[PDB]
Each structure stands twice: as C-alpha cells, then as structure tokens.
Structure 1
Amino acid sequence: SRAQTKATLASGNFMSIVNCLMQLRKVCNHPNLFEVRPILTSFVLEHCV
C-alpha cells in the first residue's frame, strides 16, 4: 500500500525492485524480520480530569 513503494516500483531501478523483493521475502519468511509484533499495552492519559 505504501505510496513510496509504488513510486519505487515505477522507478524501474533494478536494484530498488530487488530490494523490494527481498523485503517481501523477509515479510513472508517471518514477520519478526520486518517488524516485531508490538507488545500491546493500555493507552496512558497524561493527567486525570
């Protein structure tokens, strides 16, 4: 979805596409490579009312 990715694809810089492919493969192989699953926790309000 990321527009910059689309732009990169449009560029046709063979290196850039190779890198994109590498990132895709990384994402498929195990998500931790692309982004560690964030450890979910409550939202914190700055100060009570």
Structure 2
Amino acid sequence: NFMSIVNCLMQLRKVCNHPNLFEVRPILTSFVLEHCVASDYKDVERTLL
C-alpha cells in the first residue's frame, strides 16, 4: 500500500537522527545461571558429615 511505505520509512527516520526506535541499550548485567553445581553435592556433604 501507500501507507505501509510511509509507516515503514518512519522507523528509519526514527533511527538516523537519534536511536528513537525504543532506544533500549542493555545494562549488561551478568548471566543468570542458577545451577551452582556445588549445591547438588551439598546433600552428599551433609550425609557424609
């Protein structure tokens, strides 16, 4: 359509000037890995103790 062209270009025009595209830059927090392999051996430590 003629509307899809304009609405598709408004996102590039929402970029080139400033990153207005939702402008989400990750805060770069660390990884979320919850396993903590030693916790799996915690029970074995309890039984042996």
TM-score by length of structure 2 reads: 0.60
More helix by share: 1
- Which consecutive residues of structure 2, in runs of 5 or more, have no partner in the other structure? 38-49
Equivalent residue pairs, number: 36
Runs of 4+ in 1 over 3 A off after TM superposition: none
- Which consecutive residues of structure 1, in runs of 5 or more, have no partner in the other structure? 1-12
Which of the two has higher C-alpha Rg? Answer: 2
Q: What is the match of residue 6 of structure 2? A: 18
TM-score by length of structure 1 reads: 0.60
What does the per-residue CA deviation read over 1:1-49, in whole Å, with 9 as the maximum and x for residues that have no partner? xxxxxxxxxxxx1101101110000011111x11321211111112201
Cα RMSD of the aligned pairs, angstroms, is 1.2
